[PDB]
Design a protein around this ligand. Sequence first.
Ligand code: 041
Length: 321
Amino acid sequence: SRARVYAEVNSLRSREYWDYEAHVPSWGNQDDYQLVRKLGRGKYSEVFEAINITNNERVVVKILKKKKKIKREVKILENLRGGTNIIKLIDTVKDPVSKTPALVFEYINNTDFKQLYQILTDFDIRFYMYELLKALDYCHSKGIMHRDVKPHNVMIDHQQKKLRLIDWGLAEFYHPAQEYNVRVASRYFKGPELLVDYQMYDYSLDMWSLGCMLASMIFRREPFFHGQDNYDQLVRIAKVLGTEELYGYLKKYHIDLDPHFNDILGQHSRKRWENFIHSENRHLVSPEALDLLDKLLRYDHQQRLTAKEAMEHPYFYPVVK
Ligand SMILES: C=Cc1cc(O)cc2nc(-c3ccc(O)c(F)c3)oc12
């Protein structure tokens, strides 16, 4: 399998661009930063609102929990810096006591998605999805898969109508035919490819995750596919997309399906997306929304819209207007 777009991006650039193991960060002194408020945590870092005490600028400081992984994140952020709606890396620093590496970013005043998604209009969803597509078309065009697209990693300042895609710690360079670790994304946003241990995935993985976000936004079921574990996640998907459709996918790409799935997958017809409309979400759903969604949440990673293709869809006509 190969990416339909941006397949040869990395091979056509200087080795320096993508050889992140060769990258040498310069680690400055974190004592220039006062970490005033804890914002959030995860398996890979803790994040603080901070002030640069030399010039009084507001920033975020992300304290990281192997060097190779740090180098990857840093090189990717540098490669992407300046890109539309990519979080801007400002510095790479270490606390002089702890010596622990930390990344300094621009500060966005985020509106927590649980509160926000409840009050978005149809137009707002189109608007923010368009902005997130700008970030994804950009990073894909730069040979990079995010591989952790989810509401938590999409910062929105609703007042300033600003969006940043954050947490590039699972991002990787795309190289044709390379086999990638499937232990990426967060469960509810994992593409089928990850759930069946298919390693030759590409940028299309991010478009599945984006589709999951779009379904949760227009239908108000968040998350949309709520699996209890990695096995059940695929069952949840198959109850919507259908089982015969899944087997077709597995056959085409010669994927070995874990034998345990035969006990739990069942027999499910493909469900029409109209099945998810009810009186509480009707005002966020349109034929255009459902047409787009159907073209993102596809088992076959090759057939999912690219970021650029998605941006040309009628769903986004109002936003471009
Ligand atoms: C955690 C909440 C949070 C809240 C907020 O107002 C701004 C933030 N910026 C980040 C952030 C930026 C870059 C990263 O790589 C990262 F992991 C997090 O997280 C933020």
